[PDB]
Structure formats: C-alpha cells, structure tokens
Amino acid sequence: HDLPEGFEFMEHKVVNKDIHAPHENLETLRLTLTRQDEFLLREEPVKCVTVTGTNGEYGIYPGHAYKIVQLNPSPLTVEYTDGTTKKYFVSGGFAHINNEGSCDVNTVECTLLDDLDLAIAEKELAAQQAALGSAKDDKAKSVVEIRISVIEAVIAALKHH
Amino acid sequence: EAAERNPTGDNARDRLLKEVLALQARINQR
C-alpha cells in the first residue's frame, strides 16, 4: 500500500539548466508571485523585478544567476516589457531566482501598495510605540519592535510614491 | 527455574491462520 506524494499532482515543475550547456539571450523574466498558496502572477513575463532581501535590494533581470533571497517586510516592484509598473508590498518570504529565466517569489502576504492606507499606518505606529514604552518584558518589546519596523516600512513605502 | 527440573487438531488451525496472515502481509509489501 504505497501512497502518492502530494507533488505528483502538480504539473508545473521547475526547469533547471544543465551547467554544461550553451547560453541563451533572454529578454523576459517569467515571474510567479504567490501568496498563501495562491498565485497573483503566474509565469507572467516581466521585464524586471525589484525585491528587498535582508542584505539589501536586488534588481532581477532575465538571466540572473541562481540565488535564494530571504525577503523582509518591504515593497516589491514588477516592471513589464511595456514599461508599466505594478507595486506590491510583502511581509516576508523567499525569492528563488533561476538562471533559466524564472523567478518564483513566494510570500506569506502580498498586497498591492494601493490597498494600504497611510493614515491607518501612522496611527498604528503611535499605539505600538506607547506599548513599547510600557511593554512588560524584553520579549514583548521585541514583538512590538517587529510591528513598528513593518509599519515604518509601509509608511516610508507610501511616502516614496 | 525449579519448574524446569521436574516438568494436534488446534495446531492445524493455527498453521493455516499463520499462512493466511503471511500471505496478506506479503501482498501488502509488493
């Protein structure tokens, strides 16, 4: 009695390029932006994608080398070959960049920057700041500071444009 | 230990039961 593995029912596998192979000139990056097991974008050709990982900002274009990036709460930019821009905001996750010309950005939450409200973002920071002053212990203060970092990133993200 | 010093029809049913259980287990394996 052998059971199927849950990945057998998934028909869109990841294609890796053999290292001993000729290079190709690619003008499109196939992006897959995903939230909580839901793709907002699927193998969607985009000219470029800008992502904020722990070390800093990465601008991924077609042909980018194989890399894994641990994202931080921050904006994410997706620019199509039309030159049109779509800006999301992510709270965390990972970005897998493949040398074959694909980028699978899996996030816990990915919301268009339009949906976020700056007025709500500002008042929320003030509330958490008061708690951080009265936060009982070190652990509570650390959690509160996590919220503030995300809020300030959101506030700064919206003030940018 | 001191017990050691001084001191078939049902077997057929047990034998058959063991064989059937073995076959039912073998089919599971492969």
């Binding site: 199927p4 593995e5 849950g6 990945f7 890796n16 097991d37 839901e38 641990q70 899996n106 816990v108 | -």
Partner: protein, 254 residues
C-alpha cells in the same frame, strides 16, 4: 386506525428528514462553489518545495530504520458525513504502525478516532474552527506542535486528501525530513553527480548562511502543511455534497 397512522407518522418523519437534508445539500453547495477558487489558483506555490522534499523513496527502508520517532500528522475533518476520507486515512495510518510512531492528528474526528484506536501512540491533536480561511498561521501552529511532540524526529509526515476532481479525492502524503537528514542529503546533491536536478538548488543554499537555511526549511514545511489542509478542506466539502446525495436517495427508497 393507529396501525395505519403509525406508518403515516413514520413517513411524516421521513418526509422532513429529506427537507433538513435538502437544506444541508444547499448549504454544502455554497461552500463547495466558494472554495472552488482554489482550483484556479493552486499548483504553483509548491515548485521549489518539490526540490526541497520530493524524494521518491522506497516504502520499507524509510520506516524499517526508525532510529528516532516518526511523527505522523494525519488530516481529518471536524464533522462527520464527509465519506470514506477519514476511514481511508486510518487504514493508511494502520498500515504504517511502528514502535517509533507518534500521532498528532488534525480535526475532532481525527482526535476521537485516533485516541481510541491507538492509545499509547497518540499524544494530542489540533483543532481549527472552520470560521476563517486556512492561513499560514494555522500551518505554523501545526509545525510548532509537531516539533515539540518529538524534536528528535526522523520524519514528519502529513497524510491528507487531494481533490483531483469533483468526484475524485485521492490520498496524498507530504514527508518532511528533519533538519539533520535534510542538510545531509542537500550536501550530497550539491557535491555529487547524483541528484542532478537538485545540484544547482543545493549549491545555491550552501552558499548562504545557516539561519537562512533553517528559515527556508521551516517556511517550505509550512507551505506543504498549508496546501494539505487547504486541499483536505476542498475534498471535505466536495465529499459531503456527494454523501448528502447518498442520504437523499436512501431516504427516498424508504
């Protein structure tokens, strides 16, 4: 006459058993069509999760050498009337029983069924109220409890139901090896020609720092759990609609 009215009363109850069941069919045909959105938006989140964990290994060598605990996390529905999903899962679990088996089932029916049947292997279960959408936090709660149940665990295995179509609900298994065994295999896939498809992926992880790898391991493990519960819910609603048809026909024959 009382005897004649005895049948009439009996049929009176049957005639309304149908109405209550018919309303239930309507209730469960709203939630099936509400959760049909996943059908469109699935099959793309778990792409590099395959590389992380997809290993078509034998079913004997992976359980015969159970040096440490094996933590099974079957997915079961809170409410009955689903069908044969829970029964099959129990059969799938009964077929793996071991000395080193620990159970952390999900759902009230899973807890009740696995508490009675295997009483020295069950530890405790997780229950979620089907009020909100199956989210990442619930998956993180499953994993954290699983680790605390047995941190020194050879593997954590999730046994759930995959909704192939409206009438097809198979059983699927996500097997997550613990950090030590995963990083060892990840080290072999990088250096050796064996596991070619994972060569580039493994070397791209070994280049980064360890904490990132540990976060990567936990993150993808959560996604696998999230997919299983999400699928198990969709299979549940689809199965209930079918079962709540069988009851209608049985109540029509009577």
């Amino acid at each position: 006459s009382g005897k004649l009215r005895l049948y009439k009363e009996k049929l009176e109850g049957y005639n309304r058993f149908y109405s209550i069941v018919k309303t239930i069919k309507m209730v469960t045909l709203a939630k099936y069509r509400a959760a049909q959105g996943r059908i469109r938006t699935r099959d793309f989140s778990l792409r590099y999760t395959e590389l992380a964990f997809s290993k078509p290994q034998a079913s004997r060598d992976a359980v015969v050498a159970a040096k440490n605990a094996l933590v099974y996390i079957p997915i079961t529905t809170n409410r009955g009337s689903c069908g044969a999903l829970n029964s099959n899962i129990v059969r799938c679990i009964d077929s793996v029983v071991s000395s080193k088996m620990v159970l952390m089932p999900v759902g009230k029916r899973g807890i009740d069924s696995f508490s009675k049947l295997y009483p020295d292997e069950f530890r405790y279960g997780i229950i979620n109220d089907m009020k909100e959408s199956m989210h990442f936090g619930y998956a993180t709660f499953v994993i954290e409890n699983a680790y605390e149940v047995s941190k020194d665990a050879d593997r954590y295995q999730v046994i759930f139901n995959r909704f192939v179509s409206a009438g097809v609900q198979r059983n699927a298994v996500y097997n997550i090896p613990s950090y030590e065994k995963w990083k060892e295999d990840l080290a072999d896939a990088a250096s050796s020609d064996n596991q070619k498809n994972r060569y580039l992926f493994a070397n791209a992880l070994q280049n980064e720092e360890e904490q990132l790898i540990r976060d990567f391991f936990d993150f993808h493990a959560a996604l696998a759990v999230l997919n299983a519960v999400g699928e198990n819910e969709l299979s549940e609603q689809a199965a209930r609609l079918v079962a709540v048809e069988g009851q209608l026909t049985n109540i029509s024959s009577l």
